Amino acid sequence: SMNPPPPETSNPNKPKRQTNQLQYLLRVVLKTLWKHQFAWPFQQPVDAVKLNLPDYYKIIKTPMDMGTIKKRLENNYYWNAQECIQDFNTMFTNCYIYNKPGDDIVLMAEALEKLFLQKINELPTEE
Numbered sequence: 001s002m003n004p005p006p007p008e009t010s011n012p013n014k015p016k017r018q019t020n021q022l023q024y025l026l027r028v029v030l031k032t033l034w035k036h037q038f039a040w041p042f043q044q045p046v047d048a049v050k051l052n053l054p055d056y057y058k059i060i061k062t063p064m065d066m067g068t069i070k071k072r073l074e075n076n077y078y079w080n081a082q083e084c085i086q087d088f089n090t091m092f093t094n095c096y097i098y099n100k101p102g103d104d105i106v107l108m109a110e111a112l113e114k115l116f117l118q119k120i121n122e123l124p125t126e127e
């Protein structure tokens with residue numbers, strides 16, 4: 001079956017603003033995760049056709065990935081840090097839901113998530 005359209009990264013009817021926390025999420029958080037050796041499966045949407053996973057989009061109803069997050073940060077899609085953090089969390093949770101504990105893909109997601117949480121603990125104050 002065909003892949004769904006990817007999550008939107010532009011919508012003029014969505015409100016948005018720049019905040020120092022959103023700048024940090026791009027310049028520090030995304031940047032650090034993007035270059036991790038285990039980033040590559042998370043850098044674009046799951047292509048279930050390419051991966052031959054007929055069931056993926058029956059199980060994962062709210063797909064998210066770092067390619068989408070990157071474009072949302074770069075294109076000023078977000079209103080606040082919480083919206084972006086939620087996208088990261090959806091990405092990690094989808095991987096844990098779809099796959100099994102201890103699978104390679106899960107260990108990769110877990111390594112990224114550990115870093116992610118280190119980085120979010122250093123989220124600057126809104127200023």
Ligand SMILES: Cc1noc(C)c1-c1cc(O)cc([C@H](O)c2ccccc2)c1
Pocket residue numbers: 040041042046047051053094095098099104105108
């Ligand atoms: C990410 C992710 N969450 O569920 C799936 C499936 C993926 C996923 C996304 C991809 O681009 C590639 C793969 C691939 O099968 C794999 C990569 C590394 C180690 C083990 C396997 C899985």
